[PDB]
UniProtKB/Swiss-Prot annotation, chain B:
Protein name: Glycerol kinase
UniProt: ADP binding residues: 12, 16, 266, 309, 410, 414
Entry's EC annotation: 2.7.1.30
Top-level taxonomic group: Bacteria
Organism: Enterococcus casseliflavus (Enterococcus flavescens)
Gene name for this UniProt entry: glpK
Function summary: Key enzyme in the regulation of glycerol uptake and metabolism. Catalyzes the phosphorylation of glycerol to yield sn-glycerol 3-phosphate.
S-adenosyl-L-methionine as UniProt keyword: no
One Pfam family matching this protein: FGGY_C
Binding site for ATP: 12-14, 266, 309, 313, 410
A GO cellular-component term linked to this record: cytosol
Annotated GO MF terms: ATP binding; glycerol kinase activity
GO biological process: glycerol catabolic process; glycerol metabolic process; glycerol-3-phosphate metabolic process
């Protein structure tokens, strides 16, 4: 088996599977959505079993659409939505409850307490992260706290913990392998990214038994093989794992220190390669592991913009102002205003570089002359503004001048938005040839593990330069646009009603 | 180890796979639509490959929803839309062009020429059918006439003909088995339903090389085994095949002469079992093979109503009066009129017992008070009216009485309509517990072939019995409503197109 590699990308609202040849071309792909659950305001959950089914469906779909046999797959790469947490019974394999998604805030009481108990610096020094409900640590605690006899069962070695990648590999191997990779582990807030080990102090602190934790490994090595009856008779090698944003960094071939990217999906995530040394200030940002390969660990600086695509999804199902997501492209392209309406989509608090979990969504500059087209254009522009907030924060934290910026993700399909993005940044923006650089990065990792590709230089030559965007906006126009934004965000932060 | 049998129903607009257990309980299912192509008006085509992919999709989706493993499948039953034709290269395994659907009128000129040259009584004698673009025979002639190199490649033995059941089995077995069952064969208009063999006179008459033809076997027996890479990982016995309407007859357990059923889907087909011998006149109706099992062959009497659910689909996609097909029911219920409006949806001509290809869709009795609810309602009742036309024709023809009519199919969801059907027919109407009796029949034929079930008696055991519908409409109202219909249809037939 060795002519194609398969990549699985389990996302926030959908799953996808793509089969690639030794040249990096999509021979076929499938994509399927799965249910989102909002039990209380701010709470966001997923049914781990429904995610597994969305995954079985897209793996099948890609085989069908491509017409190739499973016994022809050299290896499988897995990339997933990070932080999302699942806890399940190792004997029945059944989740003890719904999975808590990275977007959820249901574990805020727990994260707030950790700050009050003064663990902020300790956590950051060990994990490179900031205490918040966003990471896995507090989600496991929430589950052990609110599920009948779960903590007691946990103390007995019956319950397992895992991010989506561990959940998937566990399923693919029918309970034989319980593993995860450096990047996913570093996003848990329970993993020391310097010593490269689960941190006992933080585990004791949260009363989480270490018997729940999976083995941590590199992003490119054979973790195991699919159970024959779990992959159509064939035992295919699972050889690549990485959080979707890290997988995207790799897929953009940003291997050199300093190279930076931005992926536009449910959220926007700006990631920069910092090399084998996280040696620099990371004030107002996160320090995580980009990837571990060839016996080495590469670090990264990241800025999280939680609401990007999910805002357009909001204009569709919330305000019902838009009919379909792609229609926002056309509506914003008909705005006759002068850009003074600002939308700050902090539905679940402001992300990097603000990290203000109290703030909520807000809109400024409204006048009777403001149309639906203006409101929609302002919603789309928000992700472009916060991206600059992050990039400019990154330049300060490293000095590293940024002359270029690679971008990818579905929301990058918008030519106008990409031009706006480059105009306010005042730097070049290069869009990937094919938007799915995440599934591509997962495939590279698996490929290198099974020798599908000789090494990094071979992937480089396999590049494919894509659409380039250049600044063309007057210096006075972007200065004002951004200044207005800064004031809108400042205004949004002054509103902290607490009933 | 087994305990389950799968049934694949490849329909007109979508495909579905269902996994059943010893008790006939639906354990898992999956449905998926595939593209419909309308090149020129009246034409309807499918890409056989996309049909193939839709089948793989629902097969996978059925396992996934059930958690059942493929190696636990005792057998596979297959049913399909019945006349749709596909011709392909036996070597490359590729179709020479899109499949022509049963709905398509593109082969009409060919059929008209045959009735002109006076071949009607002959085809009818031999096949039990009427000459029409509806059946496979003229569709194959069409493809050979219009596809470059086809006739030569077929004369040279490179091309194969097949209805959807034959196409799928060829796929599941990766070109190892080219076969079809009695029920599907009888519908090609190239099969002699009396001598049970492909008719040499009709073939030579349509210039169709016999080498294109599949072997014709019974509806219940092991045709072969899937190739592991063709069936979600393993080798499973393909043990049942039947046209969708005959499989529905079998799933309603209409095993005896006189037992009749109606299936409401894209079209509506009324089928009555006639036994081991036709033995009767079939004026205005079709005589076909119901199915072959236990070394015997059972015939059926069929009345075809081409447009039923597709009319509702037209209101949603054509005129756009409704947002979603289920909305039609809500609207019809709200109708405030007095039932004086008639819709005769003969989009491609009138079916049984009229068989008038020159007729087109018509509407009668409009007034300025006629509302959308009135119009939607009239469209829905149309199937009930023509169904009564057919039942009355079967009665006149057979002499057999019809106290009970079994019904199934998607459009059988509508209680208000089944009640209307009962009121008009003045007969009881028993709806099936599982409206998907087509997939159930297919599973039965396969179960029996592999021993999943021992005989027909064990099947009649697990009979559930759905909701019953009894007449509760005054005699005078029924006779008026139906009288208006006959006059609406009479007026529709006076307007001849081409």
């Amino acid at each position: 088996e060795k002519n194609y590699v398969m990549a699985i990308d389990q996302g926030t609202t959908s799953s996808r599977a793509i089969i690639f040849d030794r040249n990096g071309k999509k021979i076929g792909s499938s994509q399927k959505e799965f249910p989102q659950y909002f039990p209380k305001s701010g709470w966001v959950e997923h049914n781990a079993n429904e995610i597994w089914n969305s995954v079985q469906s897209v793996i099948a779909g890609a085989f069908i659409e491509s017409g190739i046999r499973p016994e022809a797959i050299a290896g499988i790469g897995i990339t997933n939505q990070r932080e999302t947490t699942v806890v399940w019974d190792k004997t029945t394999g059944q989740p003890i409850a719904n999975a808590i998604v990275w977007q959820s805030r249901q574990s805020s009481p727990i994260a707030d307490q950790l700050k009050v108990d003064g663990h902020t610096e300790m956590i950051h020094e060990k994990t490179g992260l900031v205490i918040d409900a966003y990471f896995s640590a507090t989600k496991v605690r929430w589950l052990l706290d609110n599920i009948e006899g779960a903590q007691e069962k946990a103390d007995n070695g019956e319950l397992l913990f895992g991010t989506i990648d561990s959940w998937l590999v566990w399923k693919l191997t029918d309970g034989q392998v319980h593993v995860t990779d450096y990047s996913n582990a570093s996003r848990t807030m329970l993993y020391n990214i310097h010593k490269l080990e689960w941190d006992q102090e933080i585990l004791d602190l949260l009363n989480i038994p270490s018997s729940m934790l999976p083995e941590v490994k590199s992003n490119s090595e054979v973790y195991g093989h699919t159970r024959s009856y779990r992959f159509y008779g064939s035992e295919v090698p699972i050889a690549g794992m990485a959080g979707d944003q890290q997988a995207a960094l790799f897929g953009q071939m940003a291997f050199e220190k300093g190279m930076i990217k931005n992926t536009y999906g449910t959220g926007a995530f700006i990631v920069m390669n910092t090399g084998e040394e996280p040696q620099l200030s990371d004030n107002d940002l996160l320090t995580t592991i980009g990837y571990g390969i060839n016996g080495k660990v590469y670090y990264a600086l990241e800025g999280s913009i939680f609401v990007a695509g999910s805002a357009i999804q909001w204009l569709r199902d919330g305000l019902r102002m838009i009919e379909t997501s792609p229609q926002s492209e056309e509506l914003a392209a008909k705005a006759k205003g002068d850009n003074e309406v600002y939308v700050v989509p902090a539905f679940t608090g402001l992300g990097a570089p603000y990290w203000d979990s109290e703030a909520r969504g807000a809109v400024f500059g409204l006048t009777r002359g403001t149309t639906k087209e203006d409101f929609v254009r302002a919603t789309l522009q928000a992700v472009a503004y916060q991206s600059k907030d992050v990039i400019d924060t990154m330049k300060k934290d490293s000095g590293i001048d940024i002359p270029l910026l690679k971008v990818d993700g579905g929301a990058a399909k918008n030519d106008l938005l990409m031009q706006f993005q480059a105009d306010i940044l005042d730097i070049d923006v290069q869009r990937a040839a094919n938007l799915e650089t995440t599934a591509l990065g997962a495939a590279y990792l698996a490929g290198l593990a099974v020798g599908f590709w000789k090494d990094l230089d071979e992937l480089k030559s396999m590049a494919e330069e894509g659409q380039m965007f250049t600044p063309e906006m007057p210096a006075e126009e972007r200065d004002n646009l951004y200044e207005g934004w800064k004031q809108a965000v400042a205004a949004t932060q002054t509103f902290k009603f607490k009933a």
